[PDB]
Design a protein around this ligand. Structure first.
Ligand SMILES: [Zn+2]
Length: 365
């Protein structure tokens, strides 16, 4: 059942800034190296965007008002955001698109493991070329209605654009489509595009007839970043959110709010992330379990293994704290040779380490 499965997803905290004087800067230098935003994502293996952003939480009223039958997703991932959306709205259907590559993801692996069946996905994107899956290409939009004949009411883009102009290329193409499309023009100018954007400069105008409604700053976003989500529509264009706006809102959420843990614990997922971090790791991860992984080793792979145990060992010895960057900074600055950890382990393994670290801290006391 979709609604029962929603309990494995964590509560989202965000800041909404409607686009419709001197506001001093909020600053706090957190001495953190690890990606602590994955601390409440222990229940998800491949993708985990559903823990970062949600439609019922952010655009809940817009979902109720527009009441779409089909939701369009252009996110280059395993479909965890789409998986959460299926749990929130169990009668909604989906059109899925992701850039076709062997390097990255181009199939809903996470949606399939969360929901079970792909029956609700009416357009998996199968049989499409590399450019017909690329949001920055015309032919991608020309083939979006190949199955779904419903208007693009709410289009959701989680694409991570290499170039900042590539975001614009995608936006201009969305505008061109909604103002041309026989289906979409019948629905009117009350069409939306909710997309991930990296705020870098100030007073940067959006393309012609593209108006920003609100800007959402997520707790789940990388602290050191400037990633936000912007709701866009047809109307007299305004400027994109500036780098300053985001940092202050981002800081408040980091300084004040705590990371909410998931109501339920998917043991299958936790077992999977544990074996993916260190093959042989079993739950619960106690002192006896960690001493077993040490004796098993008695080489680069054996050096990488020891680094992992030593960190998980530090978590066991560390007291239970509130899930906030102040406590994560403490955890980091109390563990000696933190630089050895960052040097030995790659970006994916370091994300896997924090998912398991999070499981531990939640399982404490
Ligand atoms: Zn259309």
């Amino acid at each position: 059942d979709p609604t029962e499965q929603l309990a494995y997803f964590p509560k989202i905290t965000f800041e909404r800034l409607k686009n419709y004087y001197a506001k001093g800067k909020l600053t706090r230098n957190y001495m953190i190296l690890l990606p602590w935003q994955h601390v409440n994502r222990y229940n998800f293996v491949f993708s985990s965007t559903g823990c970062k952003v949600s439609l019922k939480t952010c655009i809940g009223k817009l979902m109720k008002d527009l009441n779409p039958k089909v939701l369009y997703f252009i996110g280059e991932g395993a479909g965890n955001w789409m998986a959460r959306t299926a749990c929130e709205y169990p009668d909604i259907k989906f059109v899925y698109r992701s850039l076709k590559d062997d390097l990255d993801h181009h199939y809903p692996l996470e949606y399939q493991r969360v929901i079970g069946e792909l029956s609700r996905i009416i357009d998996s994107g199968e049989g499409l070329s590399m450019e017909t899956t690329d949001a920055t290409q015309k032919t991608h939009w020309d083939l979006i209605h190949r199955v779904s004949k419903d208007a693009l009411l709410i289009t959701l883009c989680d694409a991570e654009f290499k170039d900042r102009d590539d975001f614009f290329k995608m936006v201009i193409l969305w505008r061109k489509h909604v103002l041309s499309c026989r289906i979409c023009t019948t629905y009117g100018t009350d069409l939306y595009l909710f997309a991930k954007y990296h705020a870098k400069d100030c007073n940067v105008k959006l393309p012609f007839f593209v108006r920003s409604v609100a800007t959402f700053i997520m707790q789940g976003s990388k602290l050191s970043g400037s990633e936000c989500y912007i709701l866009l529509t047809l109307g007299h264009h305004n400027n994109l959110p500036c780098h300053g706006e985001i940092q202050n809102s981002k800081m408040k959420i980091a300084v004040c709010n705590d990371f909410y843990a998931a109501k339920k614990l998917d043991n299958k997922s936790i077992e999977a992330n544990c074996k993916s971090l260190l093959s042989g790791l079993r739950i619960p991860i106690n002192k006896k379990e960690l001493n077993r992984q040490r004796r098993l080793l008695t080489k680069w792979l054996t050096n990488k293994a020891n680094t992992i145990i030593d960190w998980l060992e530090h978590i066991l010895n560390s007291p239970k704290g509130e899930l906030n960057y102040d406590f994560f900074e403490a955890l980091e600055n109390t563990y000696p040779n933190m630089i050895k950890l960052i040097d030995n382990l790659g970006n994916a393994e370091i994300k896997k380490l924090i998912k398991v670290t999070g499981y531990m801290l939640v399982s404490k006391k």
